[PDB]
Amino acid sequence: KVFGRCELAAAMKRHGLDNYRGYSLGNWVCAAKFESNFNTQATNRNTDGSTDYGILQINSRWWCNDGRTPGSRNLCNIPCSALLSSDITASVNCAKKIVSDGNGMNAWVAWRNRCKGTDVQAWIRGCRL
């Protein structure tokens, strides 16, 4: 599923990401834009052989199982394919564990490089929330 901007904002808010660990909703929308272009089916292979999955490009080295990332963990206790669902529940629940792990949203490379420190409120401007 390719979400619209305000449609994703609403879904993330319902699932409890607005201000989760102090990260306002626009941070999460911005991260999703630059990680996946709002496409739940996005996948991207990394040099190390791990893969990033879904709307927030959650990586198989630590967070999910894809059966093809040797030595990896599955800290969210989910198949990586669950992160590709049109329902963002699994991705949100896993993102909550990631962002709680010490480094906050810096875990998301595109967030750090493209969202952090910017006017992220722009991402939710005009949305009915």
Which residue, 66 or 127, has its beta carbon nearer to Na ion? 66
Catalytic residue, chosen from 35, 48, 87, 119, is 35
Query: For the CA atoms of 76, 114, 40, 3, what is the dihedral angle to 10 degrees?
Result: 130
State in angstroms the smallest separation of the CB of 87 from Cl ion.
24
- Whether 48 is catalytic is no
Residues that bind Cl ion (CB under 5 A): 69, 72, 104
- Gap between the Cα atoms of 126 and 8, Å rounded: 13
- Tell me if 87 is assigned to a ligand binding site: no
Angle between helices 25-36 and 5-14 (to 10 degrees): 130
Binding site for Na ion (CB under 5 A): 60, 65, 69, 72, 74
